[PDB]
Amino acid sequence: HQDPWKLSADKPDSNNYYGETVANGMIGIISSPEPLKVKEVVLAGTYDIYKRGRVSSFIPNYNLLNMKLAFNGESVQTYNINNYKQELDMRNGAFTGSFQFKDLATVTYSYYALRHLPHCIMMVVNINTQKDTEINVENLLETPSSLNNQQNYFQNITNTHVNIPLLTSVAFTPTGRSKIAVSNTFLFDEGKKLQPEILHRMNDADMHAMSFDKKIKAGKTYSFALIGSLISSDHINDPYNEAERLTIYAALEGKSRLLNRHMQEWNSLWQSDIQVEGDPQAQQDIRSMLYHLYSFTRKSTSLSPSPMGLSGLGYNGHVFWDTEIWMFPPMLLLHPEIAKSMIEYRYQRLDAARKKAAIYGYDGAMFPWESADSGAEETPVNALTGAFEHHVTGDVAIAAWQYYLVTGDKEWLKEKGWPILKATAEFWASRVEKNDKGEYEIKNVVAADEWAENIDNNAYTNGTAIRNLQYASKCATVLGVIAPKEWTLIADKILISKMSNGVTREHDSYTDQNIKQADANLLAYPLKLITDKEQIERDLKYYQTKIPQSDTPAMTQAIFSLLYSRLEDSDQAYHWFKDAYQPNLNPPFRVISECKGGTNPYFSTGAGGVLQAVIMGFGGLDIDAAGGIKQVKSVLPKNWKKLTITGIGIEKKTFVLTH
Amino acid sequence: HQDPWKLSADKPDSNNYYGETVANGMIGIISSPEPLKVKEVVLAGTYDIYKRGRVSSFIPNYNLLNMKLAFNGESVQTYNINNYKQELDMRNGAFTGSFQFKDLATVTYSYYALRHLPHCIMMVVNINTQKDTEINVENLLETPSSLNNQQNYFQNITNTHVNIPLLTSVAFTPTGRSKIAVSNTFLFDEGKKLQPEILHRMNDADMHAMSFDKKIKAGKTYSFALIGSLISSDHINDPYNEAERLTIYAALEGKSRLLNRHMQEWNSLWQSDIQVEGDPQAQQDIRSMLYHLYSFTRKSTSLSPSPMGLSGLGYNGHVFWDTEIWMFPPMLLLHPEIAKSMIEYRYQRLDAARKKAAIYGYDGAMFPWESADSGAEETPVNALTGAFEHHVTGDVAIAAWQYYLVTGDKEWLKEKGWPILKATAEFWASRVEKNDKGEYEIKNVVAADEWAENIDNNAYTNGTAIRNLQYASKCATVLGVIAPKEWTLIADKILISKMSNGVTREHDSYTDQNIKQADANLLAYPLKLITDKEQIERDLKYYQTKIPQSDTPAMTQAIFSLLYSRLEDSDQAYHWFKDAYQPNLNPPFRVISECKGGTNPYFSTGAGGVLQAVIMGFGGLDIDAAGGIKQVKSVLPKNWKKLTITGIGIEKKTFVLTH
Ligand SMILES: OC[C@H]1O[C@@H](O)[C@H](O)[C@@H](O)[C@@H]1O
Ligand SMILES: OC[C@H]1O[C@@H](O)[C@H](O)[C@@H](O)[C@@H]1O
Ligand SMILES: OC[C@H]1O[C@@H](O)[C@H](O)[C@@H](O)[C@@H]1O
Ligand SMILES: OC[C@H]1O[C@@H](O)[C@H](O)[C@@H](O)[C@@H]1O
Ligand SMILES: OC[C@H]1O[C@@H](O)[C@H](O)[C@@H](O)[C@@H]1O
Ligand SMILES: OC[C@H]1O[C@@H](O)[C@H](O)[C@@H](O)[C@@H]1O
Ligand SMILES: OC[C@H]1O[C@@H](O)[C@H](O)[C@@H](O)[C@@H]1O
Ligand SMILES: OC[C@H]1O[C@@H](O)[C@H](O)[C@@H](O)[C@@H]1O
C-alpha cells in the first residue's frame, strides 16, 4: 500500500470508510464503499441557504454515476461479489472499482472528472464473462433531498449515424437561487444498429432511470461508458439546454478523444512534482497532498478552493485565508497559473470588499472572513470571526504582492495587484488608531488564534497590516504612482510587543493561555517580520506546547516544521512534519481530517501547509522580497536520501537536496 | 409593377399572400391582407422560451395597429370594399392601404415604424367622403397567445390644452422573463374641445379597445392618427411607465414633427444607393434588398439582425454568421455605422464567448453558433451545429478586422477589435491539433456545408481559422504589440487539401457528395485565400452542380455570381445572380424565402449575399488587405446599361460602371 502514484483499498469496510475524491476544480465526486455508486457530488460556484450556519452553502448534488448491474436478473451486492478492490490513480484522477461476480464475470469501472471539460464526468465499465450471461444495466438519477421542484426527462437525439439517449433532470436549490441541470448518456462501441434499446422508468417522484439488457458470450469483454454533464444557472443562463448540449458534444467526441485530453491535462499538472527517496510512505502522502490541491483548483479561472476543496460541504464551500496563506503559496511556486486563479477570485470580488468596508465604517476594501459567490461576508452570525477577524484583508494583499514577486508580471500588477493593494492599504490606514505615544494600534479583533476574541494588537493581525501597508507602498513605487506617505508612517509604528522573557506577545491580554493554532510564530513564517534566529527559536519554545492535542486544526505544526528546517534542526523539523498530518488521517486512503483524530476529510488547507513544510522548509525555497524564488539553508529528515522538486517558478527550475 | 421605389399589390389574395415588413431595427410590423390590420409585430432584443427549438426566441407581440372601421354601423371587411390596394414605399418605409367603401368614402391608411424613435409606431388614417356618413373607429389591443398575465388599462392624460386617452396593456413572455408594455393614443387635428369622446371597453380576458364616433359631411376629408409605443424590461427597467411616457411624448411632438424626423433619417439611409439602368425589375429588386437591410439594422446600437431580421420568428431571432459574412459586408461599404452596431453586438458578448470556450475545453473566446440576449449558445440541442459548427468564431474575427480595414479607426481597434481578435485567435490556437507531419488539423466539426457532420479539416472552417490567426497578428502590429509567434506558425500550416483533379477538397471524407451550400468556394470569396483564377474556376466547375434545387438556402449562388464577375464572365455571373433569389420570391411584394420555392420570408441573409454579388461582383468593389475600398476588374449583365453605387467607404465615393 506504498505505491507512489496509487491509493488502494481491499474490500472497502462501510463501518470505517472515508471516500476519496476525483475532481477537475469544478465537480468533485466522493467515493462510496458500495460498488458502482458514488457517495456525494459537489459543484463549485453553486451556493444557497442550506443547513449549517444559516448562510450560503455548497449543496449535495446529483449522484449522477449511480448504476445497478444485474447478471441474469441477480443484482450485484456486497454479499455476492469477491476480490472487491478500489484504487485512486493520482497520475490521472481515475477512481477504479473491480470485483468478481460469483464464478460468472469480472467487472472493472473507472470514473473521471474530465480535466479539460469542467462540467463533464465519464465512467467506463468493462465486463469479462467466464460463462454466457445477460447483463441488465440501470443508471439512476435520484434528486437529492437538497434540491426541489425537479423534473425528469428522457429523449433520443438522432441522425443517420447515432442514437444518443439522454437521461436529464432539472431541479432547484432550496430558496430557488440556482437551477441545476444534469444530463447522462450511454456510449456504446457497437454502433447505432447494434446498440441495446434504452428504456426509461419514472416510478418515483425523486428518481428516474434508463436501462438496457446485453447478452455477452463466454470469454468475451463488453465495455460501455456513462457520460454525464452537471451545470447550474451560476455557470450558464440556460443550464437545461447546456447540459444536454454538453453530453451530446462529449458523446460525439467519444471515449478515446475525451480520455486523451484528460490525460494530457493531468500530465501537464504533474510536470511540477515532489520526489522523495528513502521514504515510500512520505512519497505517497506528498503525492496525495499535490493530487488534492491539483484536483481542487483550476488554471485560467476565478475559482478559489474552500478548506475542504470539492471533497464535500466542509465550511459550506466558503473561501477563507486558507487559500491565501495555506493553499496559495505551494501552488504559486509549482503552477503560478493556479495561484493566478486564486487571486483572480479576490480581484473580481474587490467591489464587495469595498461595500463591506463602508458598511463597517472603514475605507478601502475589507475582504470578508468567509466568501462565496458575491464576495460579501458569508460567515455564520453566531461566529464572531465574521465581524471581528480582520487579518483576512492583509492575507489577500500578501498573496497579491507574492503573485507579482514570483511572476514579475507588471501588467498584472497595474491591472489587478495594485487595485487590491491600494484598497486594502486604505482599509488598514482607516482601521488603526494612533495612541498618545504615537504608536498605531488595531483594537478589538479576533486573533488568528481564534480562541482569543475581542482583544487588542494581535501579533498576526498587526503583522499582516504592516505587510499590507509596506507591499502597497512598494507596489506604488514599481508602477510610478504616488502612495500616501501615511502608509509607511503607520507600518513603521504598528505595535508588536514582547513579554518579559523576550517572547512575541500574541495579544495585549496574552500571558500563557492555550492557543488554537499558530499566530505569533506566523510573524517568522510566512510574514518574515521576525528574521532573528534567536527570536524565532524563543517564540517556538514558548508557543509550541500551547496548542492542545484535541480540536485544533492542521494550521500550526507545518509552520513549526518549516521554521525548524530553516533553523537546520532535522529532528524537530521531521517531528513536526509527521505531527502536522499523520494524526489526522482517515482510512482506507489516508485522507486528511481538520483536527487530530477528526472524521471530516479532506482538509485541503492542511495539505497546503504541509506542502509549504516540504517545499519552503525541507527544500529551503523562498519568495525573495526583491523578486523571484531563492533557496535558503535547510535540512532533510534523517531517513530522506534525496528530495527533488520540479517545475519551480516561471523558469520551471528543478531543486535537488541531499544530506 | 416596376416602380423603382414602390412595391404594389392590387386586391390582396389571403390564399396566396406574404406580408411586407416596416421596421426601424427595433420593431418590425408585418402586413396583413386584411384592411387596417397587421399580421405580426416583433420586438428586437426580447427573447424567451417559446415553441421552436426549446431555446430562447422572439415572441409574437401586440398587433397594436389593429383597427375596426364602420360606416353608418356597417363593418369594413375584405368582402365589402373595392379598388383595394396595398403599397410599400421603400423611400420612407411607409406601408399604405387604400380602398373604396360602397358609395360613402375612400379610405387611405399609412403606417410607419418611426425611424428616429425605436419604440414608437404611427398610423395615419384619411377618410374622403362621397356622401354624409358616420364612422365608428375602434383600436384593439389583443394580448397574443404568446403572452400571459395581461392587464388592460385606460386613462386620460389632461391639461388645459390636451386630453390624451391612453390604451395600455402590460403582459409577460411565457416564462415571465420579460414584461412587455404597449400604450396607444388617438391624435386629432381638431383639438381638445372638438375631438371625439373616447370610450373604453374591456369585454374579453385578452382584448380591450378604445373607440369613437365621428359624423363627416359629404365631400369632406377627416384624418386622425394612431400612435403606439411598445417596449419591454429587456429595454428599460419600468416598461409600463416608459410606454405611457413615450406615447404622451409622441402625441405632444405631433404627427408633422414625427414624420419629418422619420423622413430625414430615411433620406440619410438612401444617400447610399444602387441605381441600375436598363433593367427596371433588377432596380426594384435591389432596392427591396437595401430597404430590408436598412429596416432590419440600426446605427449607434449593439443590435444585430437574425437571418429573417424583424420579418417574423425565423430561426428564433438568433444571430448567426449570417450577420458577419452575409449582411455585414454590404452594410460596411454603404453605412459603416450599421456594420459598427453589428460588430458591437459581438464585442458586448465577448465574455459569454469566453465562458463558452471554457465550458467546451478551449482558450480565448468561442462565439456561439446561435446568439441572443446573453451571447451564450442558443442553438437547439438536436442541431449538432450548436456543439460542432465552430467557424462562427473565425467569422466574427474576419468582420472585426474588415471593420478596421474600411474605417481605419485605430481607437476602435485598440478598445474593441483587438479584444475580439486576440481572444478568437487564442481559441483557434487551442482548437488545432498538430499531426506527425507538423501540419495543424481542426478535427470533428460540422462544415459550412452543414450536410457534412462530424468530419475533419473542413475547407471553410480551416480557412476562417487561418484568417483569424493572420488578422489577429496584423492587428497586434498596428497596436505595437508582439503577437504570439505560434499564431503565424499555426496559420501557415493549417491543412487545406486538394483532390486528384486539383479541386479544393471540402473535408477529409469528401469525394463527390451533394453539398448544402458554398463551402470550398468561400475560400475564393470572401476569404480570398484562393486568388489563382484557374484554381477559382476549377473549384466553381466541380462544386457549382453539387447544390441541389430543393431545401438549399440562399447562401451559394450570390458567391458564384460574384466569382464569375471577378473572372469577367458576364453570362455566368448574371445566370447565378438571378438564380440566387428569383426562384425564392413570394407574392405579392417579391419578398425572399430561404430556399427555392420556400414560404418563410424574409431571408435577409439572402439579400445580403445578393447585394455582395452586385457591389463586390458587378461593381468590383473590394476590401483592400492594406486598408480602404479598392475596385478590381468586373463585368455587368449584358442588359445593364449602367450600374451606379453611391456612399461607398468613409470618403462616400460614387462608382459608375458601363460596358
Ligand atoms: O469523434 C472524434 C473523432 O472525429 C474524427 O473525425 C477524427 O478523425 C478523430 O481523430 C476524432 O477522435
Ligand atoms: O479552515 C477554516 C477555518 O477553520 C478554523 O478552525 C481556523 O481557526 C481558521 O483559521 C480557518 O480559517
Ligand atoms: O464558519 C463559522 C466559523 O466556524 C468556526 O469553527 C471557525 O473556527 C471560524 O473560522 C468560522 O468562521
Ligand atoms: O477548537 C475548535 C473550536 O474552535 C473555535 O475557535 C470555533 O469557534 C469552534 O467552532 C470550534 O469548535
Ligand atoms: O409640438 C412640436 C412643435 O412644438 C412647437 O413648440 C415648435 O415650434 C414646432 O416646431 C414643433 O413642431
Ligand atoms: O440562416 C441560418 C442558418 O441556416 C442554415 O440553413 C445554413 O446552413 C446556415 O449556414 C445558416 O447560418
Ligand atoms: O436552429 C437549429 C439549426 O437549424 C438548422 O435548420 C440550421 O441548418 C442550423 O444552422 C441551425 O443551427
Ligand atoms: O436542407 C435543409 C436541412 O439542412 C440541414 O442541414 C438542417 O439540419 C435541417 O434542419 C434542414 O431541414
Swiss-Prot record, chains A, B:
Q: What class of enzyme is it?
A: hydrolase
The keyword Signal is assigned to this record: yes
Q: Where does beta-D-glucose 3 bind?
A: 451, 516, 551
Q: Where in the cell is it found?
A: Periplasm
Identify one Gene Ontology CC term for this UniProt entry. Answer: periplasmic space
**Per UniProt, which keywords does this protein have?**
Carbohydrate metabolism, Glycosidase, Hydrolase, Periplasm, Signal
| GO MF annotation, one | glycosyltransferase activity
Keyword Hydrolase among record annotations? yes
Catalytic activity line of the entry: kojibiose + H2O = beta-D-glucose + D-glucose
Q: Which Pfam families match?
A: Glyco_hydro_65m (PF03632), Glyco_hydro_65N (PF03636)
Q: Provide the family line.
A: Belongs to the glycosyl hydrolase 65 family.
Which named protein is this?
Answer: Kojibiose hydrolase
- The scientific name of the source species is Flavobacterium johnsoniae (strain ATCC 17061 / DSM 2064 / JCM 8514 / BCRC 14874 / CCUG 350202 / NBRC 14942 / NCIMB 11054 / UW101)
